[PDB]
Design a protein around this ligand. Structure first.
Ligand SMILES: C[C@]12CCC(=O)C[C@H]1CC[C@@H]1[C@@H]2CC[C@]2(C)[C@@H](O)CC[C@@H]12
Length: 247
């Protein structure tokens, strides 16, 4: 039943509304990414809330969890769109916002894009399964919290453990078998850990851009400006940190 839900609640295609007739300018690319950000945020919020056992979390923790994991969730899904649609050649942000080397450099985000392209490849280098992808993605929502804990840390802990057990079950139940029930787990949890450092580089980047955003003609939609100035700082200042499997 768990896999039915994830498959059933998987959001669809989200376009960024990017004008591809216009030249690839830093402000153009980042504004489109920003807008894409506002657009996917809406979806992620509706996805997370329809997640199994999500309502078991306290109200502001439901929101907290979302406002802290959104960067990680979106990159992971983006990495995945890149794998299916284009074999991780280029980064598939949206059908109308595909980044190539030029764009990557022409976004002043080259290095970060290398890491994400690198992630998309892992989906291939490991032959990651659509069912594993979904579970992994779900687990990402419960992978970053305040060091002083949430309102009801207990419920969150119950919720996080169960999701881990599921990622473990779709690695055991008949389908691909292989006693590799361990090697496969070490690797996925290893892949899961790797989205975090990538998400941090983007967190810092989004932040600096926002501070001097109007100095570079870069528009930040409402929701995005709020979360980057209110929630991301807590991550960057160390108040909220990611949960790592390996450490
Ligand atoms: C989450 C988004 C938007 C949704 C997506 O598919 C990928 C992705 C990764 C880069 C983020 C971007 C939103 C806008 C940000 C945060 C920019 O300010 C700098 C990095 C961008």
């Amino acid at each position: 039943i768990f896999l039915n839900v994830l498959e059933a609640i998987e959001p669809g295609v989200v376009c960024a509304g990017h004008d591809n007739n216009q030249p690839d300018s830093f402000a153009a690319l980042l504004s489109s990414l920003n807008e894409l950000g506002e657009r996917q945020l809406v979806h992620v919020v509706k996805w997370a809330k329809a997640l199994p056992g999500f309502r078991n979390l306290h109200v502001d923790d439901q929101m907290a969890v979302i406002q802290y994991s959104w960067m990680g969730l979106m990159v992971f899904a983006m990495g995945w769109r890149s794998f299916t649609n284009v074999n991780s050649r280029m980064l598939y942000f949206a059908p109308d916002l595909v980044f190539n080397e030029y764009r990557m450099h022409k976004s002043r985000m080259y290095s970060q894009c290398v890491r994400m392209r690198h992630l998309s490849q892992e989906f291939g280098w490991l032959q990651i399964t659509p069912q594993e992808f979904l579970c992994m993605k779900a687990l990402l929502l419960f992978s970053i919290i305040p060091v002083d804990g949430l309102k009801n840390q207990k419920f969150f802990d119950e919720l996080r453990m169960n999701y881990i057990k599921e990622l473990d079950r779709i690695i055991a139940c008949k389908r691909k078998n292989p006693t590799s029930c361990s090697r496969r787990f070490y690797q996925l949890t290893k892949l899961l850990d790797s989205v975090q450092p990538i998400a941090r580089e983007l967190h810092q980047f989004a932040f600096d851009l926002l501070i001097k955003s109007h100095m570079v003609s870069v528009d930040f939609p409402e929701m995005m400006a709020e979360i980057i100035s209110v929630q991301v700082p807590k991550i960057l200042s160390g108040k909220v940190k990611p949960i790592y499997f390996h450490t």
